[PDB]
Amino acid sequence: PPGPPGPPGPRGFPGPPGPP
Amino acid sequence: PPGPPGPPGPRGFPGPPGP
Amino acid sequence: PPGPPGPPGPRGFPGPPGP
Amino acid sequence: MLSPKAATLAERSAGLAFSLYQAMAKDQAVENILLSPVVVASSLGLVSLGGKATTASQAKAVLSAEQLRDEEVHAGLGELLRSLSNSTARNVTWKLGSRLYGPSSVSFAEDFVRSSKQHYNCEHSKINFRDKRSALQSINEWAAQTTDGKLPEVTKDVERTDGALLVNAMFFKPHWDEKFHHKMVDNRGFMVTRSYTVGVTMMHRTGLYNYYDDEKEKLQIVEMPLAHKLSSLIILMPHHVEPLERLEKLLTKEQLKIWMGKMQKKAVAISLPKGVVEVTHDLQKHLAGLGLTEAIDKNKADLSRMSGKKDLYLASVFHATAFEWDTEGNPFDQDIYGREELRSPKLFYADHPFIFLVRDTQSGSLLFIGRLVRPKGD
């Protein structure tokens, strides 16, 4: 039988700051 | 056989407020 | 064997406007 | 299976552990929390066993056990404790030691040692607190031996040295009903805040888990059955990286029942920090804030069943735990899922602070409660 599905990729980059 | 690829990671955290 | 890691998540949402 | 008496005491213990968690969460010197309800309750049972008049009546009041006979409290808690150390069916690593340290000049009554040993497995030793270096050594070595090195030192200092110290030392390692693969571990950041990250080892598994995403209160909740499904580890985590205060206001036994009723068994990819979390709490002040005012008071305490005399008071209630997140659990068949069932899983990606608890699947009664705010890491 095949192995378990792999782990998730890493969390994405944080979002940009909002406007002033 | 190896398992399938894992899921995409979570979305990054939202950005900080502006100035 | 475990599957390979998924891709990285997307960029977070923009922050709120500056007060 | 617990007797009806023990089940009633487990419920009292659970209600108290919840009140204590909420009190400690309001304290900003408190970071990580690790609490065992029966062990907290046993501290109050010991005070009732060793105290008289209002010292003891307050202890029962904090436990909401006013309408239980004294002997019912000690018996029900004893059956609980013996059950957690049974290891017959559970296949879950639990080590607990309980030791009452008294001043060298104070003789424990023969009747109290027999009763506290009988009901609470409590050990007793006079220690001389004038020799502080040696006093810490006795406590720390006893705790390390109790936990086979998982808790190598409980405290660096004993502030109040003229009374009794109750020390509980524990090691707890949940054993999953469906094990994680030992190779599904890697290194990632844990965000303590939005500006402080600690490098941790994370472990990962995708499977079918009871799950609920509360979009309105922006939190996820997931249920992880422990070995042989007689208890579950529940994890509660907000969507964003935030102090847990907001979630803690929502958390109640009633709200939990609502959340669990909204859960559905779904494919979930769970990512958790892997490793040992060590915490020592001195519950003294928090128990006093909950109503145990006289036991902890040098000038009020009546613990003369403990010692015959009446200058002894409860100086500290040390509650020290090593809680280990590990991959090990029961093996599971080829595929009780299929090629179909695990695709597009929900992510429960615990890279920021969360609350967790262990619940008894049968009586819904709390069996452990805590939160992870700052993991250890290099």
Numbering used by the authors:
A (entry chain C): 1 to 20
B (entry chain D), C (entry chain E): 1 to 19
D (entry chain A): 35 to 412
How is this structure described in the published paper?
In order to function, collagens require the specific chaperone HSP47 for proper folding and secretion. Proper triple-helix formation as well as exit from the ER of procollagen molecules depends critically on HSP47, an ER-resident chaperone belonging to the serpin family. The interaction involves Gly-Xxx-Arg triplets exclusively on triple-helical procollagen. The arginine residue is located in the so-called Y0 position and forms a crucial salt bridge with an aspartic acid of HSP47 (16).
To explain this observation, we determined cocrystal structures of HSP47 with synthetic model peptides containing the GPRGFP and GPRGLP motifs (from here on called RGF and RGL, respectively). The complexes of HSP47:CMP[RGF/RGL] crystallized in space groups P3221 and I222, respectively, which both are different from those of all previously determined HSP47 crystal structures. The structures were refined at resolutions of 1.94 Å and 2.5 Å with refinement statistics of R/Rfree 20.3/24.8% and 21.3/26.7%. In contrast to all those RGP structures, these new ones employing the RGL and RGF collagen model peptides have only the A-site occupied by HSP47. To adapt the bulky hydrophobic side chains at the X+1 position, conformational rearrangements of HSP47 take place. In both structures, the loop containing His274 moves slightly outward by approximately 1.8 Å (Cα – Cα distance). For the phenylalanine-containing triple helix, Met225 switches to a different rotamer to form a small pocket shielding the phenylalanine from the solvent. In the RGF complex, the bound HSP47 at the A-site recognizes the arginine from the trailing chain and buries the phenylalanine from the middle strand. The results were similar to the prediction mentioned before (RGF/B and RGL/B), the phenylalanine and—less prominently—the leucine side chain clash with either the modeled second HSP47 molecule or the collagen backbone.
